[PDB]
């Protein structure tokens, strides 16, 4: 069975509206979004799907970019490093439950070498 997904709404977190947060959606992760390898990382694994029955086993904070694009949105991240964090989640996932030269790890690396160009700079 795959587990519910991270929540992503949370009326009682403290919120705030920054240009840091802003820039995090509107460009870094509406950016990274468009890239060619993305489609494995826009939702929650699929562990059924792709019957990975021990992925939910290893793996004890699931993370995906549809999942950051829904926080971002209900701004469930104060600051800009809640946020990264959650992006460096992602990654250190795959790398964890995958192995270097895995199809996805190619994929994982390209995109965590752009997030970190688009957030070498922030407003
Ligand atoms: C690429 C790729 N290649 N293949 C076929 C090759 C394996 C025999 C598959 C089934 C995929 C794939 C498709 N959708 C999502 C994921 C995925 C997403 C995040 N973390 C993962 N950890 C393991 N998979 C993960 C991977």
Known sequence: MNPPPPETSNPN????????????????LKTLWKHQFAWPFQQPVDAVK??????????????????????????????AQECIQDFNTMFTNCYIYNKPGDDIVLMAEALEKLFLQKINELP
Do not use: A, S
Request: charged share 25%; aromatic share 14%.
């Open 13 to 28: 977190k403290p919120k705030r509206q920054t240009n840091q947060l802003q820039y995090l959606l509107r460009v870094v």
């Open 50 to 79: 792709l019957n990975l029955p021990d992925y939910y086993k290893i793996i004890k904070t699931p993370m995906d970019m549809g999942t950051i694009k829904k926080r971002l949105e209900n701004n469930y991240y104060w600051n």
